Design goal:
It is classed as transcription. With 106 residues, the chain is an alpha+beta fold. The protein is 34% helix and 25% strand.
């Protein structure tokens, strides 16, 4: 994530954040922020939830201070055991994840 060709703040945000899934809906943004700080300083975590019911979907995004930190964090978190579950973390730069960021106002 050098950003040599990237000239869009929107893309930068999708590089700074990573898509986290397979996590408890009970876990809050503050808790998850701390949980995923082990693999780099986290700026902020955005928890995706069902606006109809208010119940978190078990998905969100974790923004790291550096894009390279986010990249490594993705690779470090993806495959890690999370409360006896396979933790899935994807690149938020993916269009399928960018659409979710749009709904988050990111």
């Amino acid at each position: 994530m050098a950003g040599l060709t990237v000239r869009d703040p929107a893309v930068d945000r999708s590089l700074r954040s990573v898509f986290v899934g397979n996590i408890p809906y009970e876990a809050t943004e503050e808790q998850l922020k701390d949980i995923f700080s082990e693999v780099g300083p986290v700026v902020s975590f955005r928890l995706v939830y069902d606006r109809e019911t208010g119940k978190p979907k078990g998905y969100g995004f974790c923004e790291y201070q550096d894009q390279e930190t986010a990249l490594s964090a993705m690779r470090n978190l993806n495959g890690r055991e999370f409360s006896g579950r396979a933790l899935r973390v994807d690149n938020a730069a993916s269009e399928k994840n960018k659409e979710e960021l749009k709904s988050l106002g990111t």
